Design a protein around this ligand. Structure first.
Ligand SMILES: CCCCCCCCCCCCCCCC(=O)SCCNC(=O)CCNC(=O)[C@H](O)C(C)(C)COP(=O)(O)OP(=O)(O)OC[C@H]1O[C@@H](n2cnc3c(N)ncnc32)[C@H](O)[C@@H]1OP(=O)(O)O
Ligand SMILES: CCCCCCCCCCCCCCCC(=O)SCCNC(=O)CCNC(=O)[C@H](O)C(C)(C)COP(=O)(O)OP(=O)(O)OC[C@H]1O[C@@H](n2cnc3c(N)ncnc32)[C@H](O)[C@@H]1OP(=O)(O)O
Lengths: 599, 599
C-alpha cells in the first residue's frame, strides 16, 4: 500500500534540478544515463513496495528480541536484507575500486528515500552501514579499506557509529571509553556505549563498529578523542569473519518507536580495535559518519511527511462524514467524502507542501554531495562544500520537525481511528519522534547552523543561497505566472540577511544570544529555503503549461501547493522573527531555583 | 514523583480569581470555607501522589485484558478505585438530594485536575461517570435519578457515553443503533457502538451506558436521535445490580496510548433501555455529557503540559551537558546542568507558560459553571452561560493542542533518553495524542467556536470576553509594572474584533470561509485569552511585590513567565492572522483527483 512517489522524484531531479546535465558534467557519472537511472529507480521502488513496506507493521509489533547469544530481528527483516544484498543495492553508489558499482551518491540517495518511506527501522541497518563506508573511504588505510570497506560495500558486513555513553550524547568531550595501545599496533577498547543503533542483530556475517575512545594521556575534551574500527568478529587470514572479539550487547532499549531497529547497550571488554585517522582527530573523522547520519535523518523527516500524506489522502477520499458548507457534494451518499472540508484540505496541503518542498531541498543538497565527491574544479568544489555545510543542519532539523507535524496531520485526518494501531498512522508518529532527538538534536543542529555555519563564516555560507534567491527574483519579478510569489520572496530574502546581521550584533554583546536565537533562526531558514523551492517549482509548472504539456493537472497542482505554502505556511516566519529578535534576557533572567515554585 | 501544583492552584483560584468571595456570593457554597477547601485539596493531592500516580506506568505497560467474560484493568487500578469510593470522592460536587456532598463543581474540578495529571487513563473511569451524572441530573426523571444517579454519585456504578459507530463519530445524524419501543414503556436497543471509553471493566458493581439511538419512523439525521439509559445489569427490586442485560464488549482496541482505559466495542443485542429526555431530543440531552467531556479533555491538555514541565525541570537541573555560552557556570563539575542553555530554558518556559496560563483559563471557566448551576440572578446566569459556551471549545482544542506541544518539549529536553519508556515522558506524549481526536476533534471545536458561538451570536459571546480585556487595558495602560503588556494586549484586543468582522464578511460571500478560517481563528483566540490571563497574573504579581510579600520569588517568576509568553509565544498570532485572512480559495481550488499525481 506504500507507493513510491516516482513521478515527483523525476519532476524534482530531472525537471527542477537538471539532473541529466548535472550527471553529464561530472567525472564518473557520464554512464548514469536517463534510461539506466529510471530502470534503477523502478527496481528500487519495487523492492521497497513489495519486500520491505509489508514488514513495517511487523517491525513495530514484534520489535527485536535480546538473548546473551545475540539479537533477533522481526520476522522477514533478515530475509529482506538477504534479498537487498543479492540485488547488489549496498554497492550501488560506492567506488569500483572497493567492489562498488560507482554510481552517483545522489542516485543512491533516491533509493534511500524510498527505503526510508517503506520501512525506516529496516532501512537503518543498511543506512548506518553507508555512514561507516563513507568514514572508511575518507580516513581508512589501504588495508582497512581492503579488509572492512570491501565487506561493507558488498553488504556482507554492516556498520555502526558508537559515540554515546550514559553521561554524554551531545558532549562527546566527556566520553570515557578507553583505547589502550598494544605492542602489535592495535588497541584494546574498554567502555560501555549506549543507544547503538544496529549494535547487535542477526542479519549479516559481521558488524563493524566505528568507536570514539580516548588514548592514555590524551588532552581534555574533544581534543583527546580518537576513532577505532572494532569488529564483532576479527578478520581471519582469508579476510572473512574469524575469532569472536570481546564486543557484546548487554541489553536493548524499550522505546516509543523504531522497534524494528535494535537500540543496543554495547560493552567493549578490552575488544581489539584499530586506529582510523590521526590520533586525537577522532571527532574530525567521526564527522564523516555524523554528516551522513544528519542527511539521512533529514530523509527520515521527508519520509514521515510522505507517509502521513499517503495515508491522509486515501482516507480523505474514502471516509464519508458531514456535508460541504456549500451544500451536499455527494447527495447520492449518506455523507460527503471528508476532502470536501476546508480544514481537511488544510491538513492534506500542509503535508503535501512539506513533502514536495523538502524533496526539492534534499535533491538540491544531493547535487552538492556529487560536486564535492567528483568535480575537478576547485572553485566549484569549495562552493558546493559551503552550500552542503549550510544545508545539512537546516535539512536535518527542519525536515524532521515539519515531518513530525506532517505525521500528526496524518493521524488528525483519521479522527479517533488515527490513534488505533491497525492503520499505521500512529506508528508513523512514534517512529518520527526519535528523528528530532538522534543524529544531533534540533537544538544542536540550530547551534551548528547559526554559530558555526553562518556567524563564523561571516554569512558567506548564507550568501551562497541568498544569491540564488536574489537572481531568481530579478529573473521572475515581471513573470505574470509567479510575480505573486516573487514579491514576498524578495522581501523575505532581504529580511533574511538583515535578521542575520541583527542576531550577529546581539551575539557580539551577549554570547547567550546565539542559543536564544538558534532554533527560531533555523526554522525561519528552512521556511525561507522552501519559499525559494516552491517559487521555483511554480515557475517551472507555468513554463510546462505554456509549453503545452500533456500532464496539465500535475503542474496545476504544483501551482496550487506553492500558493498554499506562501499564504498559509510561510507566515510562520513572522513569529520566528519576533521571537529571535526578542533577546536572550527573557530566557536567562529566571533563576534556576525559581522555575518550579507552584508546588 | 508526580507532585500536585497546589501553590499555583491556590494562586489562580484565591489570588487571581477571588474564589473566596465567589463561593461567599453563591447559594450552597457559603460553607465551602478556605480551611475546608484547603483540607479537601490537600487530601486530593495525597490520593493522587500516593495511590494513582504510581500506577500510571503500570497502566501503560499492562493495558487492559479482554475475555468474553469481561475486561481486566491494570494491576492496582480497581483497588485504587475502591479507595477513591471509600474516601467519598465521587460524591464531592453532586447534589445532597442524591447522596452528594453538595460542594461547588469548581472544587470538584480541582480534584479532577490533579487526578488527570497523576493518571489520566485511571481518571477517565470516574471522569466519564461525572458526565453521566450531569446528564441524569439535567434530563432524568425522579425514578431515573433515584435508581441510576444515586448509584453513580456513590461511585458504586460507573457511567459511559455511547455515540460512535464504525461509520460515524462527528456525524451523529448518520447513527443507525435502533431503540424498539416495548409495551412496558422500555426500549430494546440494538446496534454496535465503538471506541466506548470504560465500556467494560472490573472496577465497579454496574455500568450505566448513556446511548444515542433512533426510534422507528423518526426524522432523518440529528432530528431523529433519542437518548437511552442502558445498564449492564438491570436494577433488582432493592435497586442493586440484578439480571444481566444484553450488553457486552466484543473487543478492546490496541492504541498508541491511554492503554489503562479500556476502549471497547459494545454490542447492544436488543438490550433493555429507558428513554431519557424527550423523543428526538437525544442530541440536545447528550450535549450535557459532551460538554462535560470537552471541559474534562481541556483539563487533559493542561495535564500533559504540567507533566511535561515536571519531568523537564527535574532533568534540566540534574543532567550535566556542554557549558554555558558565557563560560562554565559549574566549573567544579565535568559539565553545566543543561538549564544553563537558552534553548533548554525556551522549552521549559514554553511548558510553564501553557500550564500556568491554561490553569488560569480553566478556573475562570469553572467560575462560570458555578454561576450557571447556583446563581439566582437571571442576568448573571445568562452572562455566565454565554461565557462558558464561548470558552468550552477554546479550552478543549487550545489546551489539548498546546498540551501535546508541551509534552513534546518535555521529551526534547531529555534528548535520546526522552524516547525511552522507563522515563514516562514518551507515554505522556502518547496519552496526549488522543486528546485532540476524541470529545470533538480540534476541527469540530473550531467550527463550534467560529460558526455556532461567535458568528451565530453576532459576536456577543466574544464581546463578553473582549469587554473584560478592554476594561483591564483602560485600568493598567499607565501602570508602570505592566504597561509593557497592556500596549500589545490592547492592539491584540482591537484586532480580535476586526478579524472576527473580516472572517464574518468572507463567510457571507462563501460559507467555505467558516471551515477555512476555523482552526486558525480558534488558536488565535486561545493565544489572546492567555495574553489576557498572563497580563492579569503579571498585574497581580506586581501588586503582591508592592505589598511586601514574603514569597518574592514566586511573583517575580510570574512576571518572567508573562514576559516570555508575550515576547516568544504570542507572536504566533501573526501567522494565524495571515492564514485565516488568506481565503478559502487556496484550500478549495485543488481538484480531489489532483492531490496525489506524484506516483
Ligand atoms: C547520504 C545519506 C545516506 C542515507 C543513510 C543514512 C542513514 C542513517 C540514519 C541513522 C541515524 C542514527 C544516528 C543516531 C545518533 C548517533 O549515531 S550518535 C550522534 C549524535 N551526536 C552528535 O551528532 C554529536 C554530538 N554533538 C555535537 O555535534 C557537538 O556539537 C560537538 C560537535 C561534539 C561539540 O564538540 P566541540 O569540540 O565543542 O565542537 P567544535 O569545537 O565546534 O568543533 C570541533 C571539531 O569538530 C569538527 N566539526 C564540528 N562541527 C562540524 C560540522 N558541522 N561538520 C563537520 N565537522 C564539524 C571540526 O573538525 C571542528 O574542528 P574545527 O574545524 O572547529 O577546528
Ligand atoms: C467538569 C469536568 C469534570 C471532569 C470529567 C470529564 C472527563 C471526561 C474525559 C473523557 C473523554 C472521552 C470522550 C470520548 C468521545 C466521546 O465520548 S464521543 C463524543 C465525540 N463526538 C462529539 O463530540 C460530537 C460529534 N460532533 C459534533 O459535535 C457535531 O458538530 C454535531 C453537533 C453532532 C453536528 O450535529 P448538527 O445537527 O449538525 O448540529 P447543530 O445543528 O449545529 O446543533 C444541533 C443541536 O445540538 C445542540 N448543540 C450543538 N452544538 C452545541 C454546543 N456546542 N453546546 C450545546 N448544545 C449544542 C443544540 O441543541 C442544537 O440545536 P439548536 O440549538 O441549533 O437548535
Amino acid at each position: 500500500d506504500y507507493k513510491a512517489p516516482l513521478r515527483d522524484i523525476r519532476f524534482v531531479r530531472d525537471e527542477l534540478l537538471g539532473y541529466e546535465a548535472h550527471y553529464q558534467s561530472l567525472p564518473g557519472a557520464e554512464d548514469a544515463t536517463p534510461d539506466m537511472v529510471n530502470a534503477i529507480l523502478e527496481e528500487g521502488a519495487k523492492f521497497c513496495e513489495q519486500v520491505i513496506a509489508p514488514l513495517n507493521r511487523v517491525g513495530d509489533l514484534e520489535g527485536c528480541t535480546w538473548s546473551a547469544d545475540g539479537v533477533k530481528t522481526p520476522t522477514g527483516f533478515k530475509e529482506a536484507y538477504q534479498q537487498f544484498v543479492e540485488g547488489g543495492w549496498p554497492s550501488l553508489a560506492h567506488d569500483v575500486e572497493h567492489g562498488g558499482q560507482g554510481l552517483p551518491e545522489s542516485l543512491g540517495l533516491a533509493i534511500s528515500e524510498m527505503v526510508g518511506q517503506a520501512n525506516w527501522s529496516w532501512g537503518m541497518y543498511p543506512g548506518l552501514s553507508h555512514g561507516a563506508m563513507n568514514t572508511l573511504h575518507a580516513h581508512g588505510t589501504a588495508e582497512q579499506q581492503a579488509t572492512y570497506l570491501t565487506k561493507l560495500v558488498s553488504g556482507e558486513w554492516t556498520g555502526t557509529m558508537c559515540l554515546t555513553e550514559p553521561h554524554c550524547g551531545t558532549d562527546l568531550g566527556m566520553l570515557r571509553t578507553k583505547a589502550e595501545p598494544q605492542a602489535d599496533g592495535s588497541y584494546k577498547v574498554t567502555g560501555t556505549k549506549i543507544f547503538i543503533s544496529a549494535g547487535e542483530h542477526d542479519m549479516a556475517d559481521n558488524i563493524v563498529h566505528i568507536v570514539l575512545a580516548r588514548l592514555p594521556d590524551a588532552p581534555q575534551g574533544t581534543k583527546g578523542i580518537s576513532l577505532f574500527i572494532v569488529p564483532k568478529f576479527l578478520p581471519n587470514a582469508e579476510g572473512n569473519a574469524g575469532e569472536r572479539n570481546a564486543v557484546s550487547c548487554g541489553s536493548i532499549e524499550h522505546k516509543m518507536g523504531i522497534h524494528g531497529n535494535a537500540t543496543c547497550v554495547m560493552n567493549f571488554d578490552a575488544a581489539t580495535g584499530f586506529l582510523i585517522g590521526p590520533p586525537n582527530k577522532g571527532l574530525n573523522c567521526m564527522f564523516t559518519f555524523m554528516n551522513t547520519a544528519r542527511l539521512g535523518t533529514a530523509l527520515q523527516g521527508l519520509a514521515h511527511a510522505e507517509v502521513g500524506f499517503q495515508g491522509g489522502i486515501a482516507y480523505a477520499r474514502e471516509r464519508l462524514q458531514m456535508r460541504s458548507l456549500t451544500g451536499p457534494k455527494a447527495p447520492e451518499k449518506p455523507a460527503d467524502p471528508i476532502i470536501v472540508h476546508p480544514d481537511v484540505r488544510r491538513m492534506l496541503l500542509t503535508m503535501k507542501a512539506f513533502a514536495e518542498g523538502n524533496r526539492a531541498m534534499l535533491y538540491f543538497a544531493a547535487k552538492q554531495v556529487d560536486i564535492v565527491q567528483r568535480s575537478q574544479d576547485e572553485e566549484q568544489k569549495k562552493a558546493a562544500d559551503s552550500m552542503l555545510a549550510f544545508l545539512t543542519p537546516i535539512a536535518k532539523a527542519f525536515m524532521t520537525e515539519v515531518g513530525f507535524e506532517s505525521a500528526n496531520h496524518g493521524v488528525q485526518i483519521f479522527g479517533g481511528h488515527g490513534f488505533i494501531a491497525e492503520h499505521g498512522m500512529e506508528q508513523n508518529v512514534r517512529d518520527s519522534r526519535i528523528s528530532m532527538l538522534y543524529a544531533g538534536t534540533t537544538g544542536v543542529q540550530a547551534l551548528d547552523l547559526l554559530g558555526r555555519k553562518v556567524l563564523m563564516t561571516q554569512g558567506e555560507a548564507l550568501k551562497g543561497f541568498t544569491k540564488i534567491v536574489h537572481k531568481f527574483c530579478q529573473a521572475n519579478e515581471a513573470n505574470e505566472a509567479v510575480k505573486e510569489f516573487v514579491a514576498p520572496l524578495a522581501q523575505l530574502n532581504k529580511e533574511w540577511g538583515d535578521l542575520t546581521m541583527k542576531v550577529g550584533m546581539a551575539a557580539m554583546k551577549d554570547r547567550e544570544e546565539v542559543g536564544a536565537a538558534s532554533v527560531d533562526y533555523l526554522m525561519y531558514s528552512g521556511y525561507a529555503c522552501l519559499a525559494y523551492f516552491w517559487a521555483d517549482m511554480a515557475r517551472l509548472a507555468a513554463e510546462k503549461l505554456a509549453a503545452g504539456t500533456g500532464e496539465e493537472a500535475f503542474y496545476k497542482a504544483k501551482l496550487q501547493t506553492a500558493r498554499f505554502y506562501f499564504q498559509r505556511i510561510l507566515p510562520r516566519t513572522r513569529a520566528h522573527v519576533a521571537a529571535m529578535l526578542s533577546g536572550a534576557n527573557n530566557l536567562m533572567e529566571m533563576a534556576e531555583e525559581d522555575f518550579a515554585l507552584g508546588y
